[PDB]
Design a protein around this motif. Structure first.
Motif, mmCIF file in Angstrom:
data_model
loop_
_atom_site.group_PDB
_atom_site.id
_atom_site.type_symbol
_atom_site.label_atom_id
_atom_site.label_comp_id
_atom_site.label_asym_id
_atom_site.label_seq_id
_atom_site.Cartn_x
_atom_site.Cartn_y
_atom_site.Cartn_z
ATOM 1 N N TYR C 15 -5.367 -19.399 0.248
ATOM 2 C CA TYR C 15 -4.479 -18.496 0.828
ATOM 3 C C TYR C 15 -5.263 -17.808 1.739
ATOM 4 O O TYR C 15 -5.883 -17.845 2.099
ATOM 5 C CB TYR C 15 -4.191 -18.011 -0.563
ATOM 6 C CG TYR C 15 -5.787 -17.878 -1.519
ATOM 7 C CD1 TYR C 15 -5.794 -18.488 -2.123
ATOM 8 C CD2 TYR C 15 -6.305 -16.350 -1.217
ATOM 9 C CE1 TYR C 15 -7.212 -18.587 -2.866
ATOM 10 C CE2 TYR C 15 -6.998 -16.115 -1.903
ATOM 11 C CZ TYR C 15 -7.798 -16.964 -3.366
ATOM 12 O OH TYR C 15 -8.941 -17.255 -3.642
ATOM 13 N N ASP C 16 -4.478 -16.836 2.333
ATOM 14 C CA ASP C 16 -4.821 -16.024 3.934
ATOM 15 C C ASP C 16 -6.345 -14.962 2.870
ATOM 16 O O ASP C 16 -6.776 -14.548 3.748
ATOM 17 C CB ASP C 16 -3.865 -14.450 3.750
ATOM 18 C CG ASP C 16 -3.353 -14.095 2.780
ATOM 19 O OD1 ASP C 16 -3.363 -14.169 1.612
ATOM 20 O OD2 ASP C 16 -2.954 -13.096 3.014
ATOM 21 N N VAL C 21 -10.431 -17.185 6.734
ATOM 22 C CA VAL C 21 -9.525 -17.068 7.077
ATOM 23 C C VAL C 21 -8.627 -15.972 7.760
ATOM 24 O O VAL C 21 -9.102 -14.898 6.780
ATOM 25 C CB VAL C 21 -7.821 -17.846 6.043
ATOM 26 C CG1 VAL C 21 -7.039 -18.008 7.131
ATOM 27 C CG2 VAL C 21 -8.629 -19.224 5.349
ATOM 28 N N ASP C 22 -7.807 -15.570 8.903
ATOM 29 C CA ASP C 22 -7.691 -14.708 9.676
ATOM 30 C C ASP C 22 -6.145 -14.964 9.862
ATOM 31 O O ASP C 22 -5.149 -16.219 9.862
ATOM 32 C CB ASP C 22 -8.404 -14.345 11.277
ATOM 33 C CG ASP C 22 -9.826 -14.432 11.108
ATOM 34 O OD1 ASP C 22 -10.437 -14.432 10.023
ATOM 35 O OD2 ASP C 22 -10.780 -14.741 11.974
ATOM 36 N N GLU C 23 -5.637 -13.878 9.261
ATOM 37 C CA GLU C 23 -3.975 -13.769 9.732
ATOM 38 C C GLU C 23 -3.692 -12.819 10.991
ATOM 39 O O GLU C 23 -4.785 -12.392 11.275
ATOM 40 C CB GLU C 23 -3.355 -12.861 8.705
ATOM 41 C CG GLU C 23 -2.450 -13.452 6.919
ATOM 42 C CD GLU C 23 -2.185 -13.255 6.357
ATOM 43 O OE1 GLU C 23 -2.163 -11.547 6.707
ATOM 44 O OE2 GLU C 23 -1.248 -13.854 5.418
ATOM 45 N N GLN C 24 -2.803 -12.901 11.075
ATOM 46 C CA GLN C 24 -2.313 -12.127 12.483
ATOM 47 C C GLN C 24 -1.182 -11.916 12.919
ATOM 48 O O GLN C 24 -0.061 -13.142 12.811
ATOM 49 C CB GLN C 24 -2.908 -12.876 14.028
ATOM 50 C CG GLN C 24 -3.097 -12.071 15.250
ATOM 51 C CD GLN C 24 -3.369 -12.471 16.526
ATOM 52 O OE1 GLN C 24 -4.532 -13.168 16.368
ATOM 53 N NE2 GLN C 24 -3.709 -11.711 17.910
ATOM 54 N N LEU C 36 -2.001 -17.652 11.882
ATOM 55 C CA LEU C 36 -2.855 -18.029 10.735
ATOM 56 C C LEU C 36 -4.156 -18.930 11.810
ATOM 57 O O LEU C 36 -4.182 -19.944 12.636
ATOM 58 C CB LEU C 36 -2.794 -19.039 9.752
ATOM 59 C CG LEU C 36 -1.603 -18.765 8.162
ATOM 60 C CD1 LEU C 36 -1.621 -19.401 7.454
ATOM 61 C CD2 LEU C 36 -1.589 -17.144 8.456
ATOM 62 N N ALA C 139 1.708 -9.560 8.248
ATOM 63 C CA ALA C 139 0.916 -10.301 7.686
ATOM 64 C C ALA C 139 0.642 -9.542 6.270
ATOM 65 O O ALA C 139 0.137 -10.256 5.555
ATOM 66 C CB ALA C 139 0.304 -10.813 8.810
ATOM 67 N N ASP C 140 0.996 -7.835 6.858
ATOM 68 C CA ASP C 140 0.378 -7.978 5.732
ATOM 69 C C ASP C 140 1.389 -8.228 4.473
ATOM 70 O O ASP C 140 1.181 -8.224 2.762
ATOM 71 C CB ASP C 140 0.178 -6.257 5.556
ATOM 72 C CG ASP C 140 -0.970 -5.560 6.271
ATOM 73 O OD1 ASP C 140 -1.873 -7.038 6.301
ATOM 74 O OD2 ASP C 140 -1.622 -4.949 6.195
ATOM 75 N N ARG C 143 2.550 -13.346 2.958
ATOM 76 C CA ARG C 143 0.920 -14.238 2.533
ATOM 77 C C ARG C 143 1.347 -15.913 2.669
ATOM 78 O O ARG C 143 2.420 -16.964 3.254
ATOM 79 C CB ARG C 143 0.997 -14.047 1.408
ATOM 80 C CG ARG C 143 1.661 -14.894 0.501
ATOM 81 C CD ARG C 143 1.275 -14.039 -1.821
ATOM 82 N NE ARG C 143 2.563 -14.163 -2.084
ATOM 83 C CZ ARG C 143 2.702 -13.617 -2.818
ATOM 84 N NH1 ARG C 143 2.086 -12.757 -4.164
ATOM 85 N NH2 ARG C 143 3.596 -13.638 -3.823
#
Lengths: 167, 225, 173, 167, 225, 173
Positions: C15-16, C21-24, C36, C139-140, C143
Motif C-alpha cells: 500500500y501507499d 513507495v511514492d505517490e504522485q 505510483l 493521491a491523498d 490509495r
C-alpha cells in the motif's frame, strides 16, 4: 509462451467505430480487422460489455438487437459464424462488466487471421436517438478473473499457423 | 487439552489495561492483556484466530446559528464496507451527543473526501456537542513483556494500517481480520497492543448513549484448561 | 513467554503508506507519468506470485471515482526507472472494479496474470491512461491495497532477506 | 432412522429462561436439561442465534460476553467442555440466522444425556438494562440448509448409548 | 577487514539525532546513531568495548533578597567517583550561570542527600539564573531499528541504572564502562539510545560556559572499513 | 541488522531498584529486620558463585555514615520467610569499608566467601547489627549493589531460563 492474454476495446488501432442511424441493421457499427502480422483466438464462454448509449448519453432501447458476426476478407458477412444475437435489455450496464453472475457470454469459439474481419450490427426501431460511439464503447474479454476468459494473441508459429489456416 | 476463548476489552479478568496514546507521534501502549493465575498458558495464532477492533475517538464542538455542518474533523473517514449511508452499515461511522440537552443526535449525511458531516438538528448558540467518530489513520501491532516489565519483542513487524479494520465486514466469515505470527503467554506475563496515530482514541465516555464502551478490542485465542 | 520463530517469508500486502513507495498527483491525459513508484527495499526481495488481487481506490479531489474509461497498468522496470515491455501483470479499466466490495468478495476480485519478482533495487510502476475530460487525480484522497494478508481468500506477497541458494536461484532472471 | 435432525429454541419444555440483573454473570441466564428418555448429540460447527435484547426491545451492548457451557448433573460447571465464547456484537441480529457467511458456529461438539445440563452464562457491563427473555429469545441450530448443521436426537438404543455413558 | 572508531555526539556524520525525553515515566528515544553510506557495517561488543555517558539537565530560578541556597533540584544526586568536593571532581556535578551579569559562577557547598546547593554570590532581587546539574535516577539501554522504522529487538534486556556512570571514574581503564549484548548495524539502519526517567535532559544551551554541549555520549566501536 | 544470539546465562548485577527485591527501613537497635528481601523471580534460575562483590551504601536518614562497631549479615531463607543459618556469606565489622571507594578499589573491595544457587522460589534476607547510640537507618537514602557487570573486575551473576538437565541437577537442594 508467446500467447498473450488480453481484452479488446474500441480505442485500439485495429477496430473502427461508426455512428449509426435508428433503423438500419446492415450497417457496420464496429469493425475489427486483422492486425497484419498476428493471429487472434476467442473461445466460447467469452464475455462482452457493449456499453451502448445515445447522443445524450442515455441508454438505447432495450428491445434493440445486438449481433456480432464474422465476415470474410472482403467485409461481406457470412450468415453462418455468429457468436451473439441478443438484446441490450439483458445487460445491467452498472454491473455487466463487473459481476460474472451478470456477465453474458458467447456461444462459439472464433479465430482471426491477418485479414479476417469481425463486425457488429445493431437493429433499432424507428423512434430511438440512434448511436453515438463518441460516448458509447465496447469491452470484450476479461483478463483479471479466474472467472470469465480472455483473448489469445500470437505472432506466427509454423505448426499452429498452418493448422489455423485450415478453416 | 485445550479450548477456544476470547480475550477482549474486559474478558476473563479485571486486570487487563486500557489507556490512550499521545499526540506527538511516537507509539504507545493502548491495551495490556495480562495473563492470570486462573489459566496455565495462553496462545495466539495469526491466520487462524479471528480478531476485531472498533476504534473510536472524541471530538468537541460549540454551536451557533447555522451550524448544521461539522468541519474537517482532522480524521480520514472511509465508508464502512464500501457503503456510505449510515443505517446500511454494519455500524455507525460517527455518533453525536448534545450535552446541554443531554441527548443523542441523528445524523443527516456525510462527505467523506472533505471529512465533514451534516446533522439533522441545528444546535443552539452556547450549546456544546461531542462527537464519537471512528479512528482513521494509524499503525498498530502487538508486543510482549515479561513478568518484570521488559520488552521481549514484537510479532511480525509489519504494522497493519488501521483502516483495514474498517474496510472489511468484520462480522462475515472469510473476511475477518487475521494477522501473521503466533505467541504464547506465561503466568505473570503481559502482551500489549500498541499504536501510533495523530488523534486520541477514547473509551469510557459516560455521556455516550449507545454503550458503556465506545471502542472495543476482541480476539479469539486458544487456552490450555 | 515465547513467540515462535518465523520463516524469512513474510506474507504481507502492499500500500501507499509503506516507506518504500511514492505517490504522485497526475494531470489530465498523460499515461506516461508514474502515479505510483515502488523502489527496492535495499536488501530484501519481494515476490508476487500469480493470482494476486488489486484494489486501486482511485478518486478525484472531490471524492468521486474516475471515469471507467481510464485504464490502469502495472509494469516492472529496471534499476533506473525504465520499463521492460514484458513482465506486465495487469492492464484493465476501473469499470471492471467495484470499489464498494472489490477487496471483499472473491467473485468481484481482480487478480494479476503473471508472476513477478523484485531484487534490492528493482522497481514497479503504475501507469494510468486517461482521456481529457477527467478530473485528474488526487493521491491523498486515494490509495491502493495490493494483496491480502488477512483473508482465507486471495493471496499474499512474500518478502525475504537474502538467504544463499534462495537468492542464487532468485537472481536467475 | 432413530436419529432425528432438529433445532432448539427457548419455547420448549426441556429449557428454562430466567430474566437477569445487570452484571451478575454467575447467574444462569438460560438452562437446558435432559428430557429423561432421549439423548441429544451436537457436532462442532453449529450455529447460534442468541437474540438477546432489553425490556424495551433494543439490542444489548455489543461488548457483552456470552458463554455456553456444560455442567454436571448437579448443575455445577465443569470449567472445561465449553463450546462457545464470544461477544454479541460479533453478530448481526437482522441476519445472524440467515446468511451462512454471517453465521457463527461452535468450536466443539457436545453430547447431552438424560440428566446432563447446559447453561448459558452472560457477563454484561454495569450501565446496561438487564435481559428479558420474554421479548428476547434464542434459536440453536438448523435442519433446513444444506449448509449449517442440525442436532441429533434419539431414544435409548443399546450400543450407542452404552458407548455414550462412558463419559 | 576492520578497524576501530568512536561514535559520539557529532560522530562520523551530521545525521546523528539528539532529542530529549518526556516527563511521563516511559522509555523514549534520546539519540539515534544512524549508519551512513560511507561504511558497510558497524559493530558493538559489550564486555570488550568502552562507553561514556555524562548526562546533564537544566533548571532555572529567579532572584530575591538574601538568596544563597538553591533547593532540591528534583534529582537523586550522587557524589562522583564516590567523591564529593567539586575542585577535585573529574567533571562538575553542577554548574551555574547568572544571565543578568552574564557570568559563570563557582559553588561553595552541597548537600547531596538533601539535593541542595549553596552558592558563592547573591544574585539581585529580580535576577535570572540557570543551573545545569548532572542527571540522577533513570534506566537506559540500546534499541535497534531497521530502515523501515521497525523495531527488531532490544539488546540484552537489562537496562542499566543511570547512576553507575557517575559512580565509576569513567576515564580509568578497566574501570571504564562496558555493557552486555551485541549488535551489528547495516547501511541505512539505526540504533537508538533510549531512557526512562523523571527529568528532561538538555543540550545546546547557548548560555552554557564550558563548551557547546552540556552532556555527552561516546562509544568506542569496531568498524568494517 | 544482526543482534547476536545469546546463551541463557545472562551475566548481570543486582541492586535494590530491581523487581525481585524489596527494601525496608530499620531503627537503630534491630539485628532482626529484613532490610532487604530477595525473592526468586518465578521461572528463571539464578547462580551466584563465590567471590562476588557487594556495596551496601548504608547511611542514616541524614545521609551520614554509621557507627564503627556495627556489623552486617546476609543469609538465605526457605520458601516461607525464615533464614536457614547456613548459606551466610559475610560477617564482620563496618570498620574496613570505605564508601568513597569501596566499589572502586580491588584491594578495598570485599566479596562473597562462599557459593550460592537460587531456584524460582528461594529467598535471601539481609540484617544489620547496631548498638545503642546510632540514629537509625534509612533505606531510601541508602542502596545496595551486588556484583559487577560492566567492570572487567570482580564478577557478575548468572541468570537462566529452564534447560532440561540443568534444572534436573539444580533441583539437588
Amino acid at each position: 509462451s508467446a500467447e498473450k492474454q488480453i481484452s479488446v476495446y474500441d480505442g485500439q488501432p485495429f477496430v473502427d467505430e461508426q455512428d449509426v442511424p435508428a433503423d438500419d441493421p446492415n450497417t457496420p457499427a464496429l469493425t475489427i480487422e486483422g492486425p497484419d502480422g498476428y493471429v487472434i483466438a476467442v473461445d466460447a464462454g467469452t464475455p462482452i460489455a457493449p456499453e451502448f448509449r445515445d447522443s445524450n448519453g442515455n441508454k438505447l432501447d432495450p428491445s434493440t438487437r445486438v449481433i456480432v458476426q464474422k465476415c470474410d476478407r472482403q467485409g461481406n458477412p457470412l450468415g453462418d459464424g455468429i457468436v451473439f444475437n441478443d438484446t441490450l435489455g439483458r445487460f445491467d450496464y452498472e454491473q455487466m462488466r463487473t459481476d460474472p453472475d451478470f456477465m453474458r457470454k458467447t456461444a462459439k469459439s472464433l479465430m482471426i487471421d491477418e485479414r479476417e474481419i469481425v463486425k457488429v450490427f445493431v437493429d433499432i426501431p424507428a423512434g430511438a436517438n440512434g448511436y453515438d460511439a463518441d460516448k458509447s464503447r465496447l469491452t470484450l474479454g476479461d483478463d483479471t478473473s479466474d472467472f470469465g476468459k480472455a483473448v489469445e494473441i500470437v505472432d506466427h508459429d509454423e505448426l499452429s499457423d498452418a493448422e489455423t489456416r485450415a478453416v | 487439552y485445550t479450548i477456544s476463548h476470547t480475550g477482549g476489552t474486559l474478558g476473563s479478568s479485571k486486570v487487563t489495561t486500557a489507556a490512550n496514546q499521545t499526540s506527538p507521534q511516537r507509539e504507545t501502549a493502548i491495551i495490556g492483556f495480562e495473563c492470570p493465575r486462573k489459566f496455565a498458558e495462553i496462545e495466539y495464532v495469526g491466520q487462524r484466530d479471528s480478531t476485531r477492533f472498533i476504534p473510536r475517538t472524541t471530538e468537541s464542538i460549540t454551536g451557533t446559528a447555522g451550524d448544521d455542518t461539522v468541519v474537517s474533523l482532522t480524521a480520514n473517514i472511509q465508508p464502512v464496507a464500501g457503503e456510505t449511508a449510515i443505517e446500511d452499515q454494519d455500524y455507525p461511522v460517527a455518533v453525536a451527543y448534545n450535552v446541554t440537552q443531554g441527548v443523542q443526535v441523528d445524523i443527516d449525511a456525510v462527505d467523506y473526501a472533505a471529512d465533514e458531516v451534516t446533522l439533522a438538528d441545528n444546535p443552539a448558540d452556547g450549546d456544546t456537542v461531542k462527537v464519537w467518530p471512528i479512528m482513521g489513520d494509524g499503525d498498530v501491532q502487538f508486543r510482549l513483556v515479561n513478568q518484570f516489565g521488559q520488552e521481549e519483542g514484537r510479532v511480525y513487524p509489519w504494522a497493519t494500517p488501521l483502516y483495514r479494520w474498517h474496510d472489511f465486514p468484520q462480522l462475515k466469515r472469510g473476511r475477518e481480520i487475521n494477522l501473521h505470527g503466533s505467541v504464547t503467554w506465561e503466568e505473570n506475563e503481559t502482551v500489549e497492543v500498541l499504536l501510533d496515530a495523530p488523534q486520541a482514541i477514547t473509551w469510557e465516555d459516560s455521556d455516550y448513549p449507545e454503550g458503556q464502551y465506545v471502542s472495543t478490542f476482541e480476539q479469539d485465542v486458544e487456552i490450555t484448561l
